[PDB]
Amino acid sequence: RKPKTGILMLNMGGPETLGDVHDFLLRLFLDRDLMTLPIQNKLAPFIAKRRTPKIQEQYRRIGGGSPIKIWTSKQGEGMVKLLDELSPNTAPHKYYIGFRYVHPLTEEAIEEMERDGLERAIAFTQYPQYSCSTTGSSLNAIYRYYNQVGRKPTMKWSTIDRWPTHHLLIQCFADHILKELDHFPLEKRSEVVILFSAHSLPMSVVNRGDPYPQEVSATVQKVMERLEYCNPYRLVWQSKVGPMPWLGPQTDESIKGLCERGRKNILLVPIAFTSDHIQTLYELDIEYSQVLAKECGVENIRRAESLNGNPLFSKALADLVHSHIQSNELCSKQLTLSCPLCVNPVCRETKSFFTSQQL
Amino acid sequence: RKPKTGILMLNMGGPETLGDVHDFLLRLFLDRDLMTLPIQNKLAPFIAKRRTPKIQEQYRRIGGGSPIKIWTSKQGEGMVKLLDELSPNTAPHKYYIGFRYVHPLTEEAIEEMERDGLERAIAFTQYPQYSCSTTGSSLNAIYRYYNQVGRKPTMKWSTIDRWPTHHLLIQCFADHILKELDHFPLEKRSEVVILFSAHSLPMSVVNRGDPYPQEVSATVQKVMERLEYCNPYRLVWQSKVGPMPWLGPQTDESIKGLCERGRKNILLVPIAFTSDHIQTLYELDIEYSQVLAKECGVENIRRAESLNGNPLFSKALADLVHSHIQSNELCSKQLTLSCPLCVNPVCRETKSFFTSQQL
Numbered sequence A, B: 001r002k003p004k005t006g007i008l009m010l011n012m013g014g015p016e017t018l019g020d021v022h023d024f025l026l027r028l029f030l031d032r033d034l035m036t037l038p039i040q041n042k043l044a045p046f047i048a049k050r051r052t053p054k055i056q057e058q059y060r061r062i063g064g065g066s067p068i069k070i071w072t073s074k075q076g077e078g079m080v081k082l083l084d085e086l087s088p089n090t091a092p093h094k095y096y097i098g099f100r101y102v103h104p105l106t107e108e109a110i111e112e113m114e115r116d117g118l119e120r121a122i123a124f125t126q127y128p129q130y131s132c133s134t135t136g137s138s139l140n141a142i143y144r145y146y147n148q149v150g151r152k153p154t155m156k157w158s159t160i161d162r163w164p165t166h167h168l169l170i171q172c173f174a175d176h177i178l179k180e181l182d183h184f185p186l187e188k189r190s191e192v193v194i195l196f197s198a199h200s201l202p203m204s205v206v207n208r209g210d211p212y213p214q215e216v217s218a219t220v221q222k223v224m225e226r227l228e229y230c231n232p233y234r235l236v237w238q239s240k241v242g243p244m245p246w247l248g249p250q251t252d253e254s255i256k257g258l259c260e261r262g263r264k265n266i267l268l269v270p271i272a273f274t275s276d277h278i279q280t281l282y283e284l285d286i287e288y289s290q291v292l293a294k295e296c297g298v299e300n301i302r303r304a305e306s307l308n309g310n311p312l313f314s315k316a317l318a319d320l321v322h323s324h325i326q327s328n329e330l331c332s333k334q335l336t337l338s339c340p341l342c343v344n345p346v347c348r349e350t351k352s353f354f355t356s357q358q359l
């Protein structure tokens, strides 16, 4: 018995039922690593209470919550079995789930990993493409936790901090696309537009030099290479409400514009968040989707299945943890470089934490 | 002997001497592909006159003009010699240059192509990454030339409309970066930040769905992957014009940003225009580069050589022309899809011109 290697699976998490929405949002609007608001401690609870009902309504439209915990566990369980065979010298592997905004929280998972007396811990982001708002907040949590608790790790840390072009991730995307194309009529299959859709960033975050848009773009091109460019594609970005500029084209405006220009068959691909999540206006709202079919004659909008829903995804995850171990790296080279216009002093602390680890 | 296969090398061109600046600009501000303004016929010749001295001054700072013609013709001469040997069956290949804004203008080269009575013509964009402002405007000039002159083509047209990840383009970038890294002190080499720098696009063009940022990003990933991620990198965007929002991070602000955060060694890479072109503020203005070395202590900012240049670039060009011929495609799949929010009626006209060619 006793676990020697721990794999901390990091992700923002998601409310498992609609009652969880308030506290998910509370911890989100309190995240300094995500966004800076004046008097943040006092605004958060309020914004969180004002938006709980719209976000419960959105989660109701998709089954009443997020499956991310159950899917992450099961991928975790499957990654372990494969690792136990793959890397016998790192021996009993154990996965922990570290969500940023919901239980099991990142800090909770860190405590438990210490109590378990692990030999090595691996901060394994579940976001293939790095943004400071996602992977960087989760890594910043791991450092803000030793700095809060006043103590030093009792295990050796490393991080798998991005994997935007990992060959089995790319093969899972291409498989899910092929499968979904098979649901359009055969005579039409040729004309289906592949719209890769990733969550957008505000332009001020893009302009400070966030690495995310470039890495999402790289995953897109690998996928299309693997598909031998069989259909035409675009990368668009699911933006939102507020009147701050975000990186576009926006998913909803692109769908409408595509339909206005004669493209009636559209395949949406969630290229940057591997679990089920809130869907778009044309997927959800029937008067919109009605206006659209009547004005432009939309024939089919389909969304490809989430990866974190697969099997061979486990094989992707284990294969990464295993190359990471073979390679003896502490973090990717990219993590050694802070954004050109970074204004968050913890970023640099989190970087030295990882690059300075024993081993 | 007597030419059967014409290769029209398309590019914006550049003023060969400061004398040429005015007319370069005039034709640029009159390009309705590219940009629309009110009273365009009347506004352009003005804007052209107003900006001419600024732009003469910029070209003075880089040797007194653009060497694109000589470099393009020399690359063309070398693509032709290898094409003749690679594909005997497409016979006497001949290269034409078709610049958008300076002689030999694209319509001029189409006329001469028509008189040479070629069998097949290949619109071969010299921009590896597609934007509707660059490659699209050039393809659009070809269609608007036949619609101008109210006649149908006398040869079979096809297009190489983008090549952002061509394996030899990628190998030239990588070789050029390695050679420039060799110019930094051995002790510092691993600290050098690679800043890929591509010309920016205005946000309203990004938000209508231009393919360019995603393709430039794909080229960047392929290069760093060939270099095995030896240094850290970012993709930033240069040479923004006017006060509208353009896609950032800005190259200038990123260089300043990086130095105020301790990165003293910076290798800039022209990732998206293969010829010498106007350089950035920190490379040109000394009172700025002075403030910067005094306040942040910059050690070395260097810029990799243009693909220009190299002879394995001619090999890249020949190989692409030769794969195109072997493949029998008329255009890429991506070209059959207009931007989601395209508002240019000619775009669709240009697509079906290419997709509809005999053979």
Ligand code: HEM
Pocket (backbone or CB within 6 Å): A028, A034, A035, A051, A055, A127, A131, A133, A134, A199, A200, A201, A202, A205, A212, A272, A273, A276, A277, A278
């Ligand atoms: C600084 C950049 C970002 C900001 C400011 C931001 C903002 C927000 C906010 C405010 C919410 C809570 C829901 C709401 O009030 O509407 C949210 C939820 C969410 N964000 Fe972001 N976000 C950012 C980046 C990202 C990125 C890069 C990703 C994906 C890789 C992402 C994925 C999500 C997901 C999955 C949710 C849960 C709700 C849903 O399923 O759509 N976000 N975000």
Ligand code: HEM
Pocket (backbone or CB within 6 Å): B012, B014, B028, B034, B035, B051, B055, B127, B131, B133, B134, B199, B200, B201, B202, B205, B212, B239, B241, B272, B273, B276, B277, B278
């Ligand atoms: C719609 C998007 C674009 C607009 C509106 C635009 C605007 C301009 C303008 C106005 C000029 C003349 C110089 C001046 O007056 O300052 C110029 C020059 C130039 N543009 Fe663009 N540009 C765009 C996109 C691009 C792209 C995608 C490239 C890609 C490689 C590019 C490459 C150049 C080059 C090489 C010059 C010559 C001056 C120099 O060397 O920088 N441009 N552009």
Ligand SMILES: C[C@H](CCC(=O)O)[C@H]1CC[C@H]2[C@@H]3[C@H](O)C[C@@H]4C[C@H](O)CC[C@]4(C)[C@H]3C[C@H](O)[C@]12C
Pocket (backbone or CB within 6 Å): A036, A037, A038, A047
């Ligand atoms: C005003 C400022 C804009 C950027 C900034 O100030 O940092 C923003 C950032 C978050 C904003 C608050 C949040 O945007 C939520 C509120 C939305 C209201 O309709 C506008 C005010 C509102 C209470 C905002 C007040 C003010 O506009 C804040 C605090």
Ligand SMILES: C[C@H](CCC(=O)O)[C@H]1CC[C@H]2[C@@H]3[C@H](O)C[C@@H]4C[C@H](O)CC[C@]4(C)[C@H]3C[C@H](O)[C@]12C
Pocket (backbone or CB within 6 Å): A035, A036, A037, A202, A204, A205, A240, A241, A242, A243, A244
């Ligand atoms: C969308 C979100 C909350 C919902 C809303 O009020 O629209 C609002 C409130 C807080 C806002 C963010 C915060 O004010 C902090 C950031 C400030 C930057 O100048 C723009 C992006 C930035 C990240 C904001 C963008 C956007 O308007 C946010 C994220």
Ligand SMILES: C[C@H](CCC(=O)O)[C@H]1CC[C@H]2[C@@H]3[C@H](O)C[C@@H]4C[C@H](O)CC[C@]4(C)[C@H]3C[C@H](O)[C@]12C
Pocket (backbone or CB within 6 Å): A162, A163, A164, A323, A327, A332, A333, B228, B229
């Ligand atoms: C470390 C080793 C060095 C020799 C090589 O490049 O093959 C190579 C082989 C596989 C390479 C890795 C893979 O290409 C995938 C990863 C890509 C990430 O963005 C950086 C680290 C990343 C993990 C790579 C780093 C490193 O250069 C690796 C591990």
Ligand SMILES: C[C@H](CCC(=O)O)[C@H]1CC[C@H]2[C@@H]3[C@H](O)C[C@@H]4C[C@H](O)CC[C@]4(C)[C@H]3C[C@H](O)[C@]12C
Pocket (backbone or CB within 6 Å): B036, B037, B038, B047
């Ligand atoms: C905003 C407006 C056009 C509307 C649009 O296309 O978005 C812009 C586009 C280019 C502008 C013109 C050009 O920038 C050249 C001139 C610059 C001067 O500072 C003002 C007048 C001037 C003659 C501009 C007037 C006006 O601002 C124009 C015509």
Ligand SMILES: C[C@H](CCC(=O)O)[C@H]1CC[C@H]2[C@@H]3[C@H](O)C[C@@H]4C[C@H](O)CC[C@]4(C)[C@H]3C[C@H](O)[C@]12C
Pocket (backbone or CB within 6 Å): B034, B035, B036, B037, B047, B050, B051, B202, B204, B241, B242, B243, B244
């Ligand atoms: C850079 C130049 C400024 C010239 C001057 O002020 O002397 C201006 C003149 C015409 C402008 C363009 C045109 O107005 C058309 C476009 C309108 C969009 O809202 C911004 C980008 C857009 C493509 C403009 C970018 C830029 O401001 C241009 C190119």
Ligand code: FES
Pocket (backbone or CB within 6 Å): A132, A136, A210, A337, A338, A339, A341, A342, A343, A344, A347, A348
């Ligand atoms: S905001 Fe990107 S490194 Fe800090």
Ligand code: FES
Pocket (backbone or CB within 6 Å): B132, B136, B210, B337, B338, B339, B342, B343, B344, B347
């Ligand atoms: S502007 Fe992109 S296709 Fe017309």
Ligand SMILES: [Cl-]
Pocket (backbone or CB within 6 Å): B120, B156, B157, B158, B330, B357, B358, B359
């Ligand atoms: Cl043809």
